[PDB]
Design an enzyme around this catalytic site. Structure first.
Site, PDB file in Angstrom:
ATOM      1  N   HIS A  23      17.842   1.526 -11.578  1.00  0.00           N
ATOM      2  CA  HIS A  23      17.310   2.374 -12.668  1.00  0.00           C
ATOM      3  C   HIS A  23      16.272   1.561 -13.423  1.00  0.00           C
ATOM      4  O   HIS A  23      15.715   2.332 -14.227  1.00  0.00           O
ATOM      5  CB  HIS A  23      18.355   2.979 -13.593  1.00  0.00           C
ATOM      6  CG  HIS A  23      18.977   1.973 -14.508  1.00  0.00           C
ATOM      7  ND1 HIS A  23      20.159   1.248 -14.292  1.00  0.00           N
ATOM      8  CD2 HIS A  23      18.513   1.596 -15.745  1.00  0.00           C
ATOM      9  CE1 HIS A  23      20.397   0.489 -15.373  1.00  0.00           C
ATOM     10  NE2 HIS A  23      19.404   0.682 -16.239  1.00  0.00           N
ATOM     11  N   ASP A  82      22.844   1.886  -7.633  1.00  0.00           N
ATOM     12  CA  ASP A  82      21.962   1.446  -8.734  1.00  0.00           C
ATOM     13  C   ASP A  82      21.457   0.030  -8.378  1.00  0.00           C
ATOM     14  O   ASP A  82      22.042  -0.901  -8.935  1.00  0.00           O
ATOM     15  CB  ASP A  82      22.670   1.466 -10.084  1.00  0.00           C
ATOM     16  CG  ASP A  82      21.666   1.313 -11.223  1.00  0.00           C
ATOM     17  OD1 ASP A  82      20.465   1.106 -10.939  1.00  0.00           O
ATOM     18  OD2 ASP A  82      22.055   1.382 -12.418  1.00  0.00           O
ATOM     19  N   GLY A 137      19.365  -3.101 -22.457  1.00  0.00           N
ATOM     20  CA  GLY A 137      18.459  -4.227 -22.091  1.00  0.00           C
ATOM     21  C   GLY A 137      19.132  -5.228 -21.146  1.00  0.00           C
ATOM     22  O   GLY A 137      18.384  -6.024 -20.518  1.00  0.00           O
ATOM     23  N   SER A 171      20.714  -4.400 -18.478  1.00  0.00           N
ATOM     24  CA  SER A 171      20.742  -3.838 -17.107  1.00  0.00           C
ATOM     25  C   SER A 171      20.029  -4.716 -16.094  1.00  0.00           C
ATOM     26  O   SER A 171      19.032  -5.259 -16.529  1.00  0.00           O
ATOM     27  CB  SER A 171      20.006  -2.507 -17.009  1.00  0.00           C
ATOM     28  OG  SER A 171      20.728  -1.636 -17.891  1.00  0.00           O
ATOM     29  N   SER A 184      24.797  -2.300 -14.457  1.00  0.00           N
ATOM     30  CA  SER A 184      24.361  -0.916 -14.310  1.00  0.00           C
ATOM     31  C   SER A 184      24.490  -0.198 -15.652  1.00  0.00           C
ATOM     32  O   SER A 184      23.405   0.228 -16.093  1.00  0.00           O
ATOM     33  CB  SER A 184      25.227  -0.087 -13.344  1.00  0.00           C
ATOM     34  OG  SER A 184      24.587   1.205 -13.164  1.00  0.00           O
TER      35      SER A 184
END
EC number: 3.4.21.12
Lengths: 198, 4
Positions: free
Chosen positions: A36, A63, A141, A143, A159
């Protein structure tokens, strides 16, 4: 730039994500991150300099993504822990109950334990299946950042989670946190990558 | 849960 797990990078001069793990694909250098965070060919920057672009990603469903870097980047087998580093030693998967830590640009290095595997997150974009759940906290942030054991076994990339109005799940008890990561193993075999270790 |  020195590529270390946990540091910030921007995508097309807009979103921020964190670096997961330095990897190689034959002579190509790259890092694994969250799918993502960008679309194929999106541009990644580290400290305002272009470092590479998204080479592939899957999101939602899974993801994951890998960014291929330019020749000039320095891959390191390390994950940021404040001013110190955790050395990546491999990718043995830990079991439910193992202690684990994660590193990312918003909450820094947080630790907890894995509570469940094969979890489905119902994101606005669509479901993401097969995630592992830990109770270390995380925020907007984080991720794409690293999930790793203190022994240096890389577990996967950040994720999502049940972030509260302050942007993280750090102000709620560990017992109530859901912080989910994509397993690293299927990302390495899906893209033919090898982890950089030390 | 939300991505992140």
């Amino acid at each position: 730039a020195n590529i270390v797990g946990g540091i910030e990078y921007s995508i097309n001069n807009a979103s921020l994500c964190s670096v997961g793990f330095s990897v190689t694909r034959g002579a190509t250098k790259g890092f694994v991150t969250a799918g993502h965070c960008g679309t194929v060919n999106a541009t990644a920057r580290i400290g305002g300099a272009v470092v590479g672009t998204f080479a592939a990603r899957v999101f939602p469903g899974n993801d994951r993504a890998w960014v291929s870097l330019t020749s000039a980047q320095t891959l390191l087998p390390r994950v940021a822990n404040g001013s110190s580093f955790v050395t990546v030693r491999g990718s043995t998967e830990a079991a439910v109950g193992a202690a684990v830590c994660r590193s990312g640009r918003t909450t820094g290095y947080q630790c907890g334990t894995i509570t469940a595997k094969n979890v489905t997150a119902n994101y606005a974009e669509g479901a993401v299946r097969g995630l592992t759940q830990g109770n270390a906290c995380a925020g907007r942030g984080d991720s794409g950042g690293s999930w790793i054991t203190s022994a240096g076994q890389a577990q996967g990339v950040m994720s999502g989670g049940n972030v509260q109005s302050n942007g993280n799940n750090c102000g709620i008890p560990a017992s109530q946190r859901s912080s989910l990561f994509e397993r690293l193993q299927p990302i390495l075999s899906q893209y033919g990558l090898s982890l950089v270790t030390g | 849960a939300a991505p992140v």
